[PDB]
Amino acid sequence: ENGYTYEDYKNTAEWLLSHTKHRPQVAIICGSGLGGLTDKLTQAQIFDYSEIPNFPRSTVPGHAGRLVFGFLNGRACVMMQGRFHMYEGYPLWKVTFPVRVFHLLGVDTLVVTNAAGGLNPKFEVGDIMLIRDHINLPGFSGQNPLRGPNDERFGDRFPAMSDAYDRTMRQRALSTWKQMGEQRELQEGTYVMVAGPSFETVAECRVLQKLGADAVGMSTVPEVIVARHCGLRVFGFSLITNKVIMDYESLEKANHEEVLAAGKQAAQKLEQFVSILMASIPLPDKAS
Amino acid sequence: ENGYTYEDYKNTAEWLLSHTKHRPQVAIICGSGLGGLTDKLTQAQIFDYSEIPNFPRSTVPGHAGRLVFGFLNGRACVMMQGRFHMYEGYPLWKVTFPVRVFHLLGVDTLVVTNAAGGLNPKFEVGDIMLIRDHINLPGFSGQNPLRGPNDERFGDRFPAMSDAYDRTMRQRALSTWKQMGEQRELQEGTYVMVAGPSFETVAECRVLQKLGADAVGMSTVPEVIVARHCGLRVFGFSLITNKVIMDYESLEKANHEEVLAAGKQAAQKLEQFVSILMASIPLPDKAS
Amino acid sequence: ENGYTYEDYKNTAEWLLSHTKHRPQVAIICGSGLGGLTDKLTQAQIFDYSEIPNFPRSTVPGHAGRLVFGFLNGRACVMMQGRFHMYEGYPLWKVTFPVRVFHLLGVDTLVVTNAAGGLNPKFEVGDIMLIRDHINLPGFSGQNPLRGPNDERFGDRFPAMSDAYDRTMRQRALSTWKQMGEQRELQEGTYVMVAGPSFETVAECRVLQKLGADAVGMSTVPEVIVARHCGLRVFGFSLITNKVIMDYESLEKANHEEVLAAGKQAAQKLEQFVSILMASIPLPDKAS
Numbered sequence: 001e002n003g004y005t006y007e008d009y010k011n012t013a014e015w016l017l018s019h020t021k022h023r024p025q026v027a028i029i030c031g032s033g034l035g036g037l038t039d040k041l042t043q044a045q046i047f048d049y050s051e052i053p054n055f056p057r058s059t060v061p062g063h064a065g066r067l068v069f070g071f072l073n074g075r076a077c078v079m080m081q082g083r084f085h086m087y088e089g090y091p092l093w094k095v096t097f098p099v100r101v102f103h104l105l106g107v108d109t110l111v112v113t114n115a116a117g118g119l120n121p122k123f124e125v126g127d128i129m130l131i132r133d134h135i136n137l138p139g140f141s142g143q144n145p146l147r148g149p150n151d152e153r154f155g156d157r158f159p160a161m162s163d164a165y166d167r168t169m170r171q172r173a174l175s176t177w178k179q180m181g182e183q184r185e186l187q188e189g190t191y192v193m194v195a196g197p198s199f200e201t202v203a204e205c206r207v208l209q210k211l212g213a214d215a216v217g218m219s220t221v222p223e224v225i226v227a228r229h230c231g232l233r234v235f236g237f238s239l240i241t242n243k244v245i246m247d248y249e250s251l252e253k254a255n256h257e258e259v260l261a262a263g264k265q266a267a268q269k270l271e272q273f274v275s276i277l278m279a280s281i282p283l284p285d286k287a288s
Numbered sequence: 289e290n291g292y293t294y295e296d297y298k299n300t301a302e303w304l305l306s307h308t309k310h311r312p313q314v315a316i317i318c319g320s321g322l323g324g325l326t327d328k329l330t331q332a333q334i335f336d337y338s339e340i341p342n343f344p345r346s347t348v349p350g351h352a353g354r355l356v357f358g359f360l361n362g363r364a365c366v367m368m369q370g371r372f373h374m375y376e377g378y379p380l381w382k383v384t385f386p387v388r389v390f391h392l393l394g395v396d397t398l399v400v401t402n403a404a405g406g407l408n409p410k411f412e413v414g415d416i417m418l419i420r421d422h423i424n425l426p427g428f429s430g431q432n433p434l435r436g437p438n439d440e441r442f443g444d445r446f447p448a449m450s451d452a453y454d455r456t457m458r459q460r461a462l463s464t465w466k467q468m469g470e471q472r473e474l475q476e477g478t479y480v481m482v483a484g485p486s487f488e489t490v491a492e493c494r495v496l497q498k499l500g501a502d503a504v505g506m507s508t509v510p511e512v513i514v515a516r517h518c519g520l521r522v523f524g525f526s527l528i529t530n531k532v533i534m535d536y537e538s539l540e541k542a543n544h545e546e547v548l549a550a551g552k553q554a555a556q557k558l559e560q561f562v563s564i565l566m567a568s569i570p571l572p573d574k575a576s
Numbered sequence: 577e578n579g580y581t582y583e584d585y586k587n588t589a590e591w592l593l594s595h596t597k598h599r600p601q602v603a604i605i606c607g608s609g610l611g612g613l614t615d616k617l618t619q620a621q622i623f624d625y626s627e628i629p630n631f632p633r634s635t636v637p638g639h640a641g642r643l644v645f646g647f648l649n650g651r652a653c654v655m656m657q658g659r660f661h662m663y664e665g666y667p668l669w670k671v672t673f674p675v676r677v678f679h680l681l682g683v684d685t686l687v688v689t690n691a692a693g694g695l696n697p698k699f700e701v702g703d704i705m706l707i708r709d710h711i712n713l714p715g716f717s718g719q720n721p722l723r724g725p726n727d728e729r730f731g732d733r734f735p736a737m738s739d740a741y742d743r744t745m746r747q748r749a750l751s752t753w754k755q756m757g758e759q760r761e762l763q764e765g766t767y768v769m770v771a772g773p774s775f776e777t778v779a780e781c782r783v784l785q786k787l788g789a790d791a792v793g794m795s796t797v798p799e800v801i802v803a804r805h806c807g808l809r810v811f812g813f814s815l816i817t818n819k820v821i822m823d824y825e826s827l828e829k830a831n832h833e834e835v836l837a838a839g840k841q842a843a844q845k846l847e848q849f850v851s852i853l854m855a856s857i858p859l860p861d862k863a864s
């Protein structure tokens with residue numbers, strides 16, 4: 001919703017339609033250190049958010065800040081390099097905003113990736129984690145990317161989220177992760193979106209655990225509301241870039257932008273995984 | 289508080305005093321599918337929120353959006369058909385706003401009803417649930433209908449809420465529910481206000497349970513702050529319109545606007561119950 | 577962040593530098609009933625927030641609302657009598673605002689005190705509680721005193737908070753509390769910041785307990801983000817002004833502004849403790 005009207009969104013989609021060859025079927029929104037995946041694109045047309053009629057511009061490089069329309073491995077993708085976070089200041093209905101254009105672009109599946117701090121002890125930096133559910137810690141509070149009036153043009157007043165994350169694709173994903181036989185396990189997990197940008201304290205971590213969450217992070221669960229709200233099929237992963245300290249002790253263990261190949265090998269691990277998974281995305285037309 | 293001054297509230301009360309025969313003693317605010325209760329009114333004078341000097345207008349029918357002043361079964365009621373939710377966009381101090389007029393109207397008791405998703409497993413669609421306590425999930429965050437400066441004219445800076453929901457009336461209520469010997473049990477329960485409008489995911493439901501809540505819903509706990517803050521006697525019920533899925537499995541069970549007589553029989557069940565309860569509301573004057 | 581630019585902060589620091597003899601090393605921000613500690617100051621220069629270029633002014637006495645620059649027991653202090661709360665209406669980046677001036681003033685340690693409702697049953701009104709960690713219940717939601725863009729001039733985009741509260745000083749503190757051999761124990765504890773001003777209901781209290789918190793209160797955990805974000809050394813205490821009712825029963829037990837010497841003896845207890853602790857604050861220069 002707010003700040004944007006439906007025309008804004010059309011205008012934005014329209015400009016993008018009438019400015020690119022591409023009709024993307026799949027949107028991907030990359031988390032930090034996963035932008036690299038925009039390389040896998042072919043016949044990339046890049047846009048600076050900038051140029052796009054309503055798109056939030058980022059907050060300064062920025063140049064981690066682009067929309068690249070692509071072919072990833074089958075599918076007509078549009079990818080977002082440099083997602084918006086509420087910790088940066090927009091509100092949700094600027095985070096969730098590409099998502100609503102993506103739809104209008106005719107996108108029907110959204111994949112989201114992100115980096116999260118693993119809370120689940122069975123979890124190791126480098127791990128990918130396939131999002132099964134989420135906890136919307138800002139949602140509970142007001143902060144849900146649908147707050148204000150509802151545009152029946154996009155969705156229902158009270159979309160369900162019990163099924164945000166596709167059984168089918170989590171199925172397919174989990175298959176695939178084995179089909180290529182791997183490294184460690186493809187984890188699966190509730191991701192807690194915590195806003196807002198200090199990292200947690202121990203007591204806080206402890207809470208997110210007892211609350212039940214496996215990966216804590218800070219994007220997703222707004223793209224996902226606006227996505228499921230729209231009807232997109234959603235799935236995604238968190239790269240565990242950190243084992244979240246659960247526990248009292250000294251100068252210790254964190255974070256994402258400071259591991260060797262446990263940033264950039266894991267990043268590519270997820271990136272290829274994602275690229276492969278394109279193959280499981282149901283082609284659109286009904287299409288068998 | 290915000291956006292409204294005390295004069296606004298007087299002006300609104302004043303206009304309503306000087307525009308209606310009625311001096312209501314009791315305000316009732318109905319939840320979805322309980323507006324029907326405004327039928328039980330007699331010598332109904334209806335107002336569109338619309339006409340009333342400051343009242344938030346709703347967000348579009350709207351025509352589920354009225355203030356009907358009534359006699360319910362003893363008492364001089366003013367009832368609200370179409371409560372405001374923060375998921376729609378106002379802030380609390382527009383939800384909580386009728387409540388502060390109601391006081392100024394000389395109302396001294398507020399009854400609130402709503403539809404909530406039952407979290408407590410011992411709970412069944414159709415169930416009424418008498419609110420014993422609440423958890424103010426947006427309150428913890430900022431979002432409390434008293435945030436900003438306090439008008440000692442209405443209440444204290446730091447009202448207590450441990451006693452939001454009258455022992456007396458929960459007593460009386462619970463009596464009465466037996467006095468007419470019933471169907472199922474009159475349940476009792478913490479209602480968690482969760483903002484913000486997608487329904488929860490499973491993980492989320494799980495959290496509200498371990499958090500201790502029985503009914504999850506999305507109004508009340510702002511009317512109740514502003515009410516107790518004002519001194520009104522508050523009590524209320526949730527119609528369980530849903531057994532909240534606690535648990536992983538397929539295309540399943542939800543929601544309120546889609547049960548047969550487990551919408552409209554339960555609605556009337558609560559509505560009569562409410563009408564009867566008028567009888568337990570202490571008449572005002574000290575009055576024995 | 578928001579609403580303020582970096583110049584504002586300099587201007588404010590600059591005006592205060594160029595308007596006072598003092599260069600404070602330590603900032604102290606007092607909680608209710610601990611303002612008295614500004615008496616221990618010597619060569620007090622008082623400022624009304626008022627006079628200070630950007631400082632939020634309070635919301636009305638107000639006259640519990642001053643910045644007194646002092647010498648407490650060694651150290652060059654600047655103290656804040658009448659902290660801002662978000663329940664009053666500013667946003668965090670007006671609570672957290674003195675803190676950022678304090679830095680710019682060259683302050684490098686911040687001590688925060690407050691009154692909290694004890695949740696931990698092993699806890700008794702009068703108790704001081706040394707803050708070991710916090711739970712940032714509004715932080716999880718959006719409400720973190722760093723939300724919006726980050727000024728690398730003050731800190732990192734993603735400051736850690738696992739170490740908000742100094743091991744060293746909690747060490748020193750805990751030493752000292754024994755060194756003067758005492759009354760009861762110096763407690764230690766997670767403080768939950770809950771926003772937002774009604775007191776909790778029982779169900780709510782129950783939640784903050786299972787969430788793990790010992791003292792619930794309503795300031796600190798924003799000064800602390802902006803402080804650690806800045807690099808200040810932070811530590812502090814909560815005066816337990818209340819044993820938070822955990823439990824269902826009648827007209828019972830609360831609150832802070834209504835105990836005899838379990839307001840004002842405890843206040844002085846904490847105040848001296850604080851004054852003594854000045855002695856443990858590492859002098860600044862590297863300084864051995």
Ligand SMILES: O=c1[nH]c(S)nc2ccccc12
Binds near residue numbers: 194243254256
């Ligand atoms: O290690 C982390 N803790 C938290 S709260 N959020 C994160 C987001 C991305 C990477 C790591 C983290």
Ligand SMILES: O=c1[nH]c(S)nc2ccccc12
Binds near residue numbers: 405532
């Ligand atoms: O079934 C429900 N889940 C949630 S979160 N809120 C509700 C509000 C009204 C009716 C049902 C529900």
Ligand SMILES: O=c1[nH]c(S)nc2ccccc12
Binds near residue numbers: 691774776792819832
């Ligand atoms: O007794 C209290 N409960 C809560 S929620 N907050 C407080 C803050 C200061 C003093 C007491 C309290």
